[PDB]
Symmetry: C3
Subunit: 217 residues, 3 copies
């Protein structure tokens, strides 16, 4: 129902210790990247946020992260979900710590929110108060600065991004032009923490507005 949280799920987790040189080459790993932590989940943007959180908690880097075409509901195999993330670190210890931080964040109550009665429109509006090394790089902003991470389906996202930009003193850093691999859209916005928060609130209200009246113009 409307305002219900859609719980994200982790599907599989594995560690690679002493990664093969051939694989290290193709992933373009650094010399201190000896171990990899692999994760898949059924919700990509929650996982991207959680991987960023991991870079704060442990000496890991996000070296690979991609979404699956047409999203988790169209997965053809059990563990594909709609995202794969790869953390790299100096040892299995640091990679396990990074994976533990990722898992803790994914279970923390964050997620997409339903905008209607059968949960067929949903959105993500997450304020990241202090970015780690992954989302700051993706947005092109300085490490440690705040972001608003806003995602909705294509039309809702375009309409609601406009409302979010008018509601607060925020800049658009990165535009997820529709379609993303999962057929969503959105953006990463930056500004002060309170402005990002304001942007999140306005974004959520605007998506809900479209959901309640999709054809009115």
């Amino acid at each position: 129902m409307k305002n219900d949280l859609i719980r994200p799920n982790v599907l599989s987790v594995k560690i690679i210790s002493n990664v093969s040189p051939e694989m290290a080459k193709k992933l373009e790993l650094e010399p201190h990247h000896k171990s990899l932590g692999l994760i898949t989940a059924d919700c990509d943007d929650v996982t991207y946020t959680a991987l960023d959180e991991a870079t704060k908690a442990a000496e890991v880097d996000v070296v690979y992260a991609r979404s699956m075409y047409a999203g988790a509901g169209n997965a053809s195999t059990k563990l594909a979900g709609e995202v794969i993330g790869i953390l790299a670190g100096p040892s299995p210890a640091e990679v396990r710590s990074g994976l533990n931080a990722t898992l803790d964040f994914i279970d923390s109550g964050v997620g997409f929110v339903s905008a209607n009665e059968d949960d067929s429109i949903c959105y993500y509006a997450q304020c990241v108060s202090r970015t780690g090394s992954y989302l700051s790089k993706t947005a092109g902003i300085r490490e440690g600065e705040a972001l608003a991470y806003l995602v909705a389906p294509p039309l809702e996202a375009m309409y609601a991004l406009d409302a979010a930009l008018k509601a607060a003193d925020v800049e658009m850093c990165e535009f997820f032009a529709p379609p993303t691999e999962t057929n969503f859209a959105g953006a990463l916005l930056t500004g002060s923490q309170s402005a990002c928060k304001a942007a999140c609130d306005a974004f959520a209200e605007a998506v809900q507005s479209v959901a309640s009246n999709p054809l009115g113009f």
Copy 2:
């Protein structure tokens, strides 16, 4: 069943009255683009044709138009369909005029056509007699020149395009190599209105022939 029209549906329409400058920057809008019209539907190629029609009825430009991966049948949310289109114009009234023309066209009886008994193969074979500003740019031709807009599933499209090019006095402008986002394929062909119609008929006939004999190649 065979030759039935598959009716396209509009899922959502919105107008942004005064677009924020941050948005205008990322969409690379021109300074006179003040208002946006947004539309989603469950059929991309009909919608692209309709958006082109809107540019003939009003002073609007198509500034954004993209298809969704794996098509409307695989949509995960209610309003995503398989296409988003964005019109831009100098005012909300002009954008409204453009969207009305888009909706009327989508409702006019155009659409994909079934090639078989359970509608599991379908194609689009549409003669655009006078292109607007969107399809003419896309195809690289003068505004007002004719197009055949031909779309089918991947093998059918390759086979039927060859037939259409042989049957009719037409040139290939743009090739949609398989897969498009929706896992279709096709092309835009130009020529006289008469030749584009003949290309449409030959394309339709060839798609039907593949549907009726999908494994036959020894003759």
Copy 3:
């Protein structure tokens, strides 16, 4: 169930006997490519392997070969499957021979293999003893050399590729980074025939290992969280 073969199916096959110049241009065909053979099927990597086998049987080149977004189980039309392949040759007779070889290979018993009880995880671990002109060009090796053709879903593939590279004297030629259009991943590895076989064996074992215990990490390392 586990170790069952998943049978691949051909959906459509056609020949264009004399290709139009307009189409020849867009496909960037060679001057001696006069005829095209078209094929779709519900399994892409088996079909790519079969197309390579065709280049050994007839005077044909693979000029086009692409997978469909989100795979065959999400196809919206009957004949799209998850792959289209296009063979080109100098005459309909050669294309005809190439397509027959392609069909025969697809029916030969090769395929993806199930990794678990409900066939919800599957993988391809195929030892190509003697590459034709298509896979050799793709991998950057000489025609006739061996390949290990390894495909699985994204996390399984990454884990199992590492196992395969450590199991034998093989080199990574081509890496299919996740996701491919079908949301799989994998690689082409080369080495001697026996090394490619060992790599196939280790890959298959590693995929099965993940399938039977995808979240063991939780018990072992996420305790008291």
